[PDB]
Amino acid sequence: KPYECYICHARFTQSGTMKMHILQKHVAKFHCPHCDTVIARKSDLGVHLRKQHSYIEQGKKCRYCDAVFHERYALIQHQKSHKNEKRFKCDQCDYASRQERHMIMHKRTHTGKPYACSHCDKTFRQKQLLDMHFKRYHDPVPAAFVCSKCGKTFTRRNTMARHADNCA
DNA sequence: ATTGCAGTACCACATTTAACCAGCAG
DNA sequence: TCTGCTGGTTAAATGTGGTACTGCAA
Ligand SMILES: [Zn+2]
Ligand SMILES: [Zn+2]
Ligand SMILES: [Zn+2]
Ligand SMILES: [Zn+2]
Ligand SMILES: [Zn+2]
Ligand SMILES: [Zn+2]
C-alpha cells in the first residue's frame, strides 16, 4: 500500500496518515482545558477527557483517605496528597506507616506473635525477618565487619564505623 | 563488647495506566 | 481529503516486597 513519505520513506497506507507523519516528525499541541497535560493528537485529547473528566455518577473513595470524587482526575490527583506521606495511621497508638505491611506488624504489638520456630518454643512478632533466630540458634557465620586498619571485628557495621572514625 | 526487637533504608521486581500510533469508517 | 474513534502496543510511576540495617534498651 502506498504512499512513501519523501523525507523518510514511510510506509503509510493512506495519504492523510502519511501527512500526519510529516506533522508528527517533520511539533504540536493540544492542552487539556482542565488539566495541565498535553496530548500528541487531538483525538487522543478526546479520549483523555472522556476518561479523566467525565462525571462519575457514584463517587469513588480515596484508597487511603475518606474523600470521594466524581471526577477521575480529581481522584488521582488527591491520592497525590498521600504519596510519600505516612498514609496508614494507627488507631491504638500514634505510630504511622507509609506501607501497610508495616502497619500490620505494628498492630501486633498492641494485639499480641504468630511466627513460630519449628525447632523451639519461640514466637516472633514480625514476619520471617525474625526467623533469623533460626540461623543463629538452629545453626547451619555471623558477619565480620572489619575495621581499618586496626583490623578489629564488630558484629555490626554502625559500631565498626563509629570506631573507624577515630582509630590508629 | 553483645543481642533481640521494632521499625527504617535501600534496592529490585511486578502491576498499572495513560498517551502513542496506524489504520478505519463515515 | 477530513475528522473522530479505536484497539492493541509501550514505558514511567508506582505498588509490592525481601532484607540489610539501625537505635534502643536490656
Ligand atoms: Zn518523514
Ligand atoms: Zn485533563
Ligand atoms: Zn485521600
Ligand atoms: Zn499502634
Ligand atoms: Zn527456634
Ligand atoms: Zn580501628
Side-chain angles (χ1 to χ4, degrees), chain A residues 131-134 136-138 140 142-148 150-162:
Chain A
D131 262 10
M132 87 176 316
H133 143 111
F134 193 68
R136 326 243 291 169
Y137 291 89
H138 300 295
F145 289 145
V146 309
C147 161
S148 14
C150 75
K152 286 167 226 156
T153 278
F154 298 93
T155 61
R156 300 216 173 173
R157 194 203 298 295
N158 24 302
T159 92
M160 170 251 138
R162 194 161 332 113

mmCIF file of all heavy atoms in Angstrom, chain A residues 131-162, unseen atoms left out:
data_model
loop_
_atom_site.group_PDB
_atom_site.id
_atom_site.type_symbol
_atom_site.label_atom_id
_atom_site.label_comp_id
_atom_site.label_asym_id
_atom_site.label_seq_id
_atom_site.Cartn_x
_atom_site.Cartn_y
_atom_site.Cartn_z
ATOM 1 N N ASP A 131 12.944 -14.793 61.845
ATOM 2 C CA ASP A 131 13.259 -16.238 61.863
ATOM 3 C C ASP A 131 14.765 -16.500 61.571
ATOM 4 O O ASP A 131 15.240 -17.607 61.470
ATOM 5 C CB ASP A 131 12.336 -17.037 60.949
ATOM 6 C CG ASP A 131 11.187 -17.696 61.707
ATOM 7 O OD1 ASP A 131 11.004 -17.378 62.894
ATOM 8 O OD2 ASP A 131 10.471 -18.533 61.123
ATOM 9 N N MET A 132 15.456 -15.379 61.506
ATOM 10 C CA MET A 132 16.887 -15.348 61.537
ATOM 11 C C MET A 132 17.363 -15.810 62.903
ATOM 12 O O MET A 132 18.534 -16.052 63.096
ATOM 13 C CB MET A 132 17.394 -13.968 61.191
ATOM 14 C CG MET A 132 17.507 -13.007 62.340
ATOM 15 S SD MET A 132 18.224 -11.499 61.682
ATOM 16 C CE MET A 132 19.522 -12.152 60.642
ATOM 17 N N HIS A 133 16.439 -15.938 63.846
ATOM 18 C CA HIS A 133 16.678 -16.655 65.080
ATOM 19 C C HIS A 133 17.040 -18.055 64.640
ATOM 20 O O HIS A 133 17.879 -18.704 65.242
ATOM 21 C CB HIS A 133 15.406 -16.629 65.956
ATOM 22 C CG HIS A 133 15.125 -17.886 66.730
ATOM 23 N ND1 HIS A 133 15.217 -17.951 68.107
ATOM 24 C CD2 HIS A 133 14.709 -19.111 66.335
ATOM 25 C CE1 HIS A 133 14.887 -19.159 68.513
ATOM 26 N NE2 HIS A 133 14.569 -19.886 67.459
ATOM 27 N N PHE A 134 16.393 -18.528 63.590
ATOM 28 C CA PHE A 134 16.667 -19.863 63.121
ATOM 29 C C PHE A 134 18.113 -20.009 62.689
ATOM 30 O O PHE A 134 18.736 -21.007 62.985
ATOM 31 C CB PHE A 134 15.746 -20.213 61.966
ATOM 32 C CG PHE A 134 15.737 -21.665 61.624
ATOM 33 C CD1 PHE A 134 15.193 -22.583 62.491
ATOM 34 C CD2 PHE A 134 16.273 -22.107 60.437
ATOM 35 C CE1 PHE A 134 15.186 -23.918 62.181
ATOM 36 C CE2 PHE A 134 16.272 -23.442 60.120
ATOM 37 C CZ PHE A 134 15.726 -24.348 60.994
ATOM 38 N N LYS A 135 18.656 -19.024 61.993
ATOM 39 C CA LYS A 135 20.040 -19.117 61.557
ATOM 40 C C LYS A 135 21.009 -19.161 62.719
ATOM 41 O O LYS A 135 21.931 -19.959 62.739
ATOM 42 C CB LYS A 135 20.398 -17.942 60.659
ATOM 43 N N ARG A 136 20.789 -18.311 63.707
ATOM 44 C CA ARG A 136 21.675 -18.256 64.857
ATOM 45 C C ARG A 136 21.634 -19.446 65.797
ATOM 46 O O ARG A 136 22.663 -19.895 66.278
ATOM 47 C CB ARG A 136 21.462 -16.965 65.634
ATOM 48 C CG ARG A 136 21.100 -15.789 64.752
ATOM 49 C CD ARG A 136 22.150 -14.699 64.814
ATOM 50 N NE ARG A 136 22.167 -14.039 66.108
ATOM 51 C CZ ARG A 136 23.114 -13.206 66.500
ATOM 52 N NH1 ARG A 136 24.126 -12.929 65.704
ATOM 53 N NH2 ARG A 136 23.042 -12.656 67.694
ATOM 54 N N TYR A 137 20.441 -19.934 66.094
ATOM 55 C CA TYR A 137 20.318 -20.944 67.128
ATOM 56 C C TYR A 137 20.148 -22.376 66.659
ATOM 57 O O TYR A 137 20.367 -23.308 67.418
ATOM 58 C CB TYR A 137 19.181 -20.576 68.066
ATOM 59 C CG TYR A 137 19.474 -19.373 68.911
ATOM 60 C CD1 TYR A 137 19.175 -18.106 68.464
ATOM 61 C CD2 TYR A 137 20.049 -19.505 70.156
ATOM 62 C CE1 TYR A 137 19.439 -17.002 69.237
ATOM 63 C CE2 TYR A 137 20.312 -18.408 70.936
ATOM 64 C CZ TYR A 137 20.006 -17.164 70.471
ATOM 65 O OH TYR A 137 20.271 -16.067 71.245
ATOM 66 N N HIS A 138 19.791 -22.557 65.403
ATOM 67 C CA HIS A 138 19.451 -23.869 64.911
ATOM 68 C C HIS A 138 20.332 -23.992 63.698
ATOM 69 O O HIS A 138 19.902 -24.005 62.561
ATOM 70 C CB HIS A 138 17.941 -23.925 64.654
ATOM 71 C CG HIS A 138 17.133 -23.654 65.890
ATOM 72 N ND1 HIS A 138 17.156 -24.493 66.974
ATOM 73 C CD2 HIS A 138 16.332 -22.616 66.242
ATOM 74 C CE1 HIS A 138 16.396 -24.003 67.934
ATOM 75 N NE2 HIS A 138 15.907 -22.849 67.529
ATOM 76 N N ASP A 139 21.605 -24.152 64.020
ATOM 77 C CA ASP A 139 22.735 -23.447 63.469
ATOM 78 C C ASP A 139 23.449 -24.060 62.296
ATOM 79 O O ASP A 139 24.391 -24.837 62.473
ATOM 80 C CB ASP A 139 23.732 -23.203 64.588
ATOM 81 N N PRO A 140 22.999 -23.611 61.053
ATOM 82 C CA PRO A 140 23.852 -24.033 59.934
ATOM 83 C C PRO A 140 25.327 -23.700 60.169
ATOM 84 O O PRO A 140 26.202 -24.347 59.600
ATOM 85 C CB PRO A 140 23.332 -23.180 58.772
ATOM 86 C CG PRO A 140 21.879 -23.135 58.986
ATOM 87 C CD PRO A 140 21.799 -22.835 60.440
ATOM 88 N N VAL A 141 28.077 -18.359 61.062
ATOM 89 C CA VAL A 141 28.599 -17.341 60.161
ATOM 90 C C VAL A 141 28.057 -15.948 60.473
ATOM 91 O O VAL A 141 27.396 -15.335 59.635
ATOM 92 C CB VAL A 141 28.316 -17.712 58.715
ATOM 93 N N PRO A 142 28.369 -15.444 61.748
ATOM 94 C CA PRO A 142 27.988 -14.032 61.923
ATOM 95 C C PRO A 142 28.906 -13.135 61.100
ATOM 96 O O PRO A 142 30.064 -13.486 60.948
ATOM 97 C CB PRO A 142 28.217 -13.764 63.418
ATOM 98 C CG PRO A 142 28.278 -15.088 64.078
ATOM 99 C CD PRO A 142 29.019 -15.890 63.076
ATOM 100 N N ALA A 143 28.412 -12.010 60.593
ATOM 101 C CA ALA A 143 29.212 -11.116 59.755
ATOM 102 C C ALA A 143 30.392 -10.483 60.481
ATOM 103 O O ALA A 143 30.292 -10.120 61.642
ATOM 104 C CB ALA A 143 28.332 -10.039 59.156
ATOM 105 N N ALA A 144 31.527 -10.420 59.794
ATOM 106 C CA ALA A 144 32.758 -9.841 60.327
ATOM 107 C C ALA A 144 32.861 -8.331 60.557
ATOM 108 O O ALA A 144 33.289 -7.904 61.612
ATOM 109 C CB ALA A 144 33.929 -10.298 59.473
ATOM 110 N N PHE A 145 32.463 -7.517 59.594
ATOM 111 C CA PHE A 145 32.592 -6.068 59.753
ATOM 112 C C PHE A 145 33.970 -5.529 60.176
ATOM 113 O O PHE A 145 34.069 -4.803 61.146
ATOM 114 C CB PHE A 145 31.511 -5.541 60.672
ATOM 115 C CG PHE A 145 30.161 -5.564 60.062
ATOM 116 C CD1 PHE A 145 29.052 -5.829 60.821
ATOM 117 C CD2 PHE A 145 30.005 -5.324 58.730
ATOM 118 C CE1 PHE A 145 27.806 -5.858 60.256
ATOM 119 C CE2 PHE A 145 28.763 -5.350 58.154
ATOM 120 C CZ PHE A 145 27.658 -5.616 58.919
ATOM 121 N N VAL A 146 35.033 -5.898 59.476
ATOM 122 C CA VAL A 146 36.380 -5.486 59.866
ATOM 123 C C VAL A 146 36.618 -3.986 59.817
ATOM 124 O O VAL A 146 36.197 -3.337 58.885
ATOM 125 C CB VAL A 146 37.435 -6.146 58.968
ATOM 126 C CG1 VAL A 146 37.202 -7.635 58.900
ATOM 127 C CG2 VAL A 146 37.389 -5.566 57.569
ATOM 128 N N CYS A 147 37.306 -3.452 60.819
ATOM 129 C CA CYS A 147 37.763 -2.067 60.816
ATOM 130 C C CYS A 147 39.047 -1.934 60.041
ATOM 131 O O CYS A 147 39.698 -2.917 59.756
ATOM 132 C CB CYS A 147 37.975 -1.550 62.230
ATOM 133 S SG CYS A 147 39.031 -0.090 62.359
ATOM 134 N N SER A 148 39.393 -0.711 59.674
ATOM 135 C CA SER A 148 40.666 -0.442 59.025
ATOM 136 C C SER A 148 41.409 0.695 59.727
ATOM 137 O O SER A 148 40.825 1.727 59.994
ATOM 138 C CB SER A 148 40.464 -0.108 57.548
ATOM 139 O OG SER A 148 39.106 0.159 57.254
ATOM 140 N N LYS A 149 42.699 0.537 59.992
ATOM 141 C CA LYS A 149 43.416 -0.692 59.732
ATOM 142 C C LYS A 149 43.564 -1.566 60.962
ATOM 143 O O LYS A 149 44.094 -2.664 60.869
ATOM 144 C CB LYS A 149 44.793 -0.375 59.163
ATOM 145 N N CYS A 150 43.098 -1.097 62.110
ATOM 146 C CA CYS A 150 43.297 -1.845 63.343
ATOM 147 C C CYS A 150 42.903 -3.305 63.208
ATOM 148 O O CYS A 150 43.304 -4.131 64.005
ATOM 149 C CB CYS A 150 42.580 -1.185 64.512
ATOM 150 S SG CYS A 150 40.810 -1.401 64.510
ATOM 151 N N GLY A 151 42.146 -3.616 62.170
ATOM 152 C CA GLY A 151 41.762 -4.976 61.874
ATOM 153 C C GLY A 151 40.779 -5.601 62.836
ATOM 154 O O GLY A 151 40.525 -6.806 62.730
ATOM 155 N N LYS A 152 40.209 -4.834 63.763
ATOM 156 C CA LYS A 152 39.259 -5.408 64.707
ATOM 157 C C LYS A 152 37.939 -5.738 64.011
ATOM 158 O O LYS A 152 37.590 -5.168 62.975
ATOM 159 C CB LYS A 152 39.011 -4.454 65.880
ATOM 160 C CG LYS A 152 40.161 -4.363 66.878
ATOM 161 C CD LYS A 152 39.984 -3.175 67.820
ATOM 162 C CE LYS A 152 41.276 -2.385 67.957
ATOM 163 N NZ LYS A 152 41.026 -0.980 68.373
ATOM 164 N N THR A 153 37.207 -6.682 64.599
ATOM 165 C CA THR A 153 35.936 -7.160 64.074
ATOM 166 C C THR A 153 34.795 -6.674 64.961
ATOM 167 O O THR A 153 34.954 -6.545 66.179
ATOM 168 C CB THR A 153 35.951 -8.695 63.977
ATOM 169 O OG1 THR A 153 36.613 -9.090 62.768
ATOM 170 C CG2 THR A 153 34.554 -9.300 64.021
ATOM 171 N N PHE A 154 33.648 -6.394 64.343
ATOM 172 C CA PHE A 154 32.439 -5.991 65.045
ATOM 173 C C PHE A 154 31.243 -6.688 64.423
ATOM 174 O O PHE A 154 31.170 -6.843 63.202
ATOM 175 C CB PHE A 154 32.243 -4.473 64.995
ATOM 176 C CG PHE A 154 33.344 -3.699 65.656
ATOM 177 C CD1 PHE A 154 34.425 -3.240 64.923
ATOM 178 C CD2 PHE A 154 33.299 -3.434 67.014
ATOM 179 C CE1 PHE A 154 35.441 -2.528 65.533
ATOM 180 C CE2 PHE A 154 34.312 -2.724 67.632
ATOM 181 C CZ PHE A 154 35.384 -2.269 66.890
ATOM 182 N N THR A 155 30.298 -7.100 65.259
ATOM 183 C CA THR A 155 29.129 -7.783 64.732
ATOM 184 C C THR A 155 28.159 -6.829 64.049
ATOM 185 O O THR A 155 27.158 -7.288 63.490
ATOM 186 C CB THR A 155 28.404 -8.534 65.851
ATOM 187 O OG1 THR A 155 27.969 -7.602 66.850
ATOM 188 C CG2 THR A 155 29.324 -9.562 66.493
ATOM 189 N N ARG A 156 28.437 -5.521 64.061
ATOM 190 C CA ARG A 156 27.532 -4.543 63.473
ATOM 191 C C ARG A 156 28.302 -3.418 62.787
ATOM 192 O O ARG A 156 29.256 -2.843 63.342
ATOM 193 C CB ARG A 156 26.568 -3.977 64.531
ATOM 194 C CG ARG A 156 25.700 -5.053 65.189
ATOM 195 C CD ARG A 156 24.288 -4.604 65.527
ATOM 196 N NE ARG A 156 23.491 -5.737 65.997
ATOM 197 C CZ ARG A 156 22.262 -5.641 66.496
ATOM 198 N NH1 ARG A 156 21.675 -4.455 66.596
ATOM 199 N NH2 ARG A 156 21.616 -6.729 66.901
ATOM 200 N N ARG A 157 27.854 -3.059 61.597
ATOM 201 C CA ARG A 157 28.501 -2.011 60.829
ATOM 202 C C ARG A 157 28.589 -0.705 61.579
ATOM 203 O O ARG A 157 29.647 -0.111 61.678
ATOM 204 C CB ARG A 157 27.766 -1.789 59.521
ATOM 205 C CG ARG A 157 28.550 -0.966 58.528
ATOM 206 C CD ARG A 157 27.628 -0.300 57.530
ATOM 207 N NE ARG A 157 26.889 -1.287 56.763
ATOM 208 C CZ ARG A 157 27.444 -2.147 55.922
ATOM 209 N NH1 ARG A 157 28.751 -2.144 55.723
ATOM 210 N NH2 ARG A 157 26.690 -3.012 55.278
ATOM 211 N N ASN A 158 27.479 -0.263 62.138
ATOM 212 C CA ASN A 158 27.439 1.063 62.706
ATOM 213 C C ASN A 158 28.446 1.218 63.810
ATOM 214 O O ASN A 158 29.105 2.240 63.901
ATOM 215 C CB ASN A 158 26.051 1.411 63.245
ATOM 216 C CG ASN A 158 25.234 0.194 63.609
ATOM 217 O OD1 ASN A 158 24.986 -0.664 62.771
ATOM 218 N ND2 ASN A 158 24.806 0.118 64.856
ATOM 219 N N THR A 159 28.569 0.214 64.660
ATOM 220 C CA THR A 159 29.565 0.285 65.710
ATOM 221 C C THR A 159 30.967 0.309 65.118
ATOM 222 O O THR A 159 31.823 1.047 65.573
ATOM 223 C CB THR A 159 29.408 -0.830 66.758
ATOM 224 O OG1 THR A 159 30.202 -1.951 66.390
ATOM 225 C CG2 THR A 159 27.976 -1.272 66.868
ATOM 226 N N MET A 160 31.205 -0.500 64.101
ATOM 227 C CA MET A 160 32.513 -0.526 63.487
ATOM 228 C C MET A 160 32.807 0.802 62.857
ATOM 229 O O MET A 160 33.916 1.295 62.926
ATOM 230 C CB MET A 160 32.595 -1.599 62.422
ATOM 231 C CG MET A 160 33.848 -1.523 61.577
ATOM 232 S SD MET A 160 33.446 -0.966 59.928
ATOM 233 C CE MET A 160 34.781 0.171 59.630
ATOM 234 N N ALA A 161 31.813 1.369 62.204
ATOM 235 C CA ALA A 161 32.027 2.608 61.503
ATOM 236 C C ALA A 161 32.391 3.670 62.495
ATOM 237 O O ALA A 161 33.286 4.455 62.270
ATOM 238 C CB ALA A 161 30.784 2.993 60.744
ATOM 239 N N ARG A 162 31.700 3.681 63.618
ATOM 240 C CA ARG A 162 31.947 4.700 64.605
ATOM 241 C C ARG A 162 33.355 4.566 65.095
ATOM 242 O O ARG A 162 34.051 5.547 65.268
ATOM 243 C CB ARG A 162 30.996 4.547 65.774
ATOM 244 C CG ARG A 162 30.961 5.759 66.678
ATOM 245 C CD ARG A 162 29.716 5.782 67.545
ATOM 246 N NE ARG A 162 28.585 5.104 66.923
ATOM 247 C CZ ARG A 162 28.058 3.978 67.380
ATOM 248 N NH1 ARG A 162 28.563 3.408 68.463
ATOM 249 N NH2 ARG A 162 27.031 3.424 66.762
#
